[PDB]
Ligand binder design. Sequence first.
Ligand SMILES: CCCC[C@H](NC(=O)CCC(=O)O)P(=O)(O)Oc1ccccc1
Lengths: 216, 213
Amino acid sequence: EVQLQESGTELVKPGASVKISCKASGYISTDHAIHWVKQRPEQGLEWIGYISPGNGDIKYNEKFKVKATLTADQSSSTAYMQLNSLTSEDSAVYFCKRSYYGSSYVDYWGQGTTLTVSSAKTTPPSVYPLAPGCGDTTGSSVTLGCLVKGYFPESVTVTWNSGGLSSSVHTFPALLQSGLYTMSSSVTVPGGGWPSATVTCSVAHPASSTTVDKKL
Amino acid sequence: DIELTQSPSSLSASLGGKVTITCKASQDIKKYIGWYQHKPGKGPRLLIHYTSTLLPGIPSRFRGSGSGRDYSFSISNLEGGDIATYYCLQYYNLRTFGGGTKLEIKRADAAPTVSIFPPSSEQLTSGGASVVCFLNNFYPKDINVKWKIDGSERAQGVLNSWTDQDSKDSTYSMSSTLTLTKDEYERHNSYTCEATHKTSTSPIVKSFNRNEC
Ligand SMILES: CCCC[C@H](NC(=O)CCC(=O)O)P(=O)(O)Oc1ccccc1
């Protein structure tokens, strides 16, 4: 039906230039202008500009005039946005959407492209076990953790106890430490003293091929 | 271009009551403003256009109003499922969105169960030491956690990240890691995690005595 299909994740080095697409199927490309919208980490949306494939005018956010170049390949109904001089600040999700006219039923947005911009290369995560030490332990519950330290790029799945311990798993979002990503999780299990089923955290990082199972 | 101030960002709503978001423009924008909903996971869903005109399928508990520069968005019954960010979007002259209202569900205050974790031996053999202090299940979001060595407040090395609000409990948890080099770590013994949180006047301090217990 009407779809705006976007380019897959672009991982790229600072200073470079990227070109991201919006493949407009299911309707007549020249009918609606394509706007591109920027989605900021944690919160916020920023309009970049639009290209109308009909009369051909493009209008940009003043703020993006030098950063973005908007274009459309009319023959294939693919509109592309190019981003010049990628700083780390352009890490973001970018979306294209066809304009909404009058009172139409639904507003069509693309699925977005994530651009993570950096000079780092693929690195397997360094996993370490976190278990409470000798702090009395004569009661309460126990909280066990695993520190997924230093990896690139984002994508790490920390399955607890090969799925068994779904109970209350907190998984804290990853943040950048010195150029790589660090992240962690915690499970709390019923009362004191976990030693019975070798609890195990298992973290996997797709781009690498890594499967670490730290139990002890 | 026209600026569009929108407030609040964060609203703690109780499920069952109403929320009133507001966007004030820099020029008169002639009722050309729209309101979007943006949950995690999906692209923004349009809710209202040209100030008051609801969308096909959008419920009438959502309502929109306003005229010159001032405009308001209203959700009469906050439903478990309206927890999203709402941006407004003028289009009287190019397009400009408001910063957004992140809604979260308001609930009883609850105090954090703190834990501190020593370096894992394997991290030491690598040459590093991250001490990690978990602050699980509290409300509200605000917690100020201090890291101390032998009573000495260390602030660099500290990495902090919070969990999203848990669907089935409505608390938030936090993780705090202090990354130090093997040497710095071996020259000190006490490491202290100190949460200053609304639920209690006195700071929640937790310390572990290095290795020997
Ligand atoms: C509030 C809906 C009005 C949509 C705008 N459309 C009109 O201004 C067209 C005239 C008409 O109502 O017929 P547009 O989709 O271009 O702006 C954007 C730009 C970026 C994201 C979302 C919408």
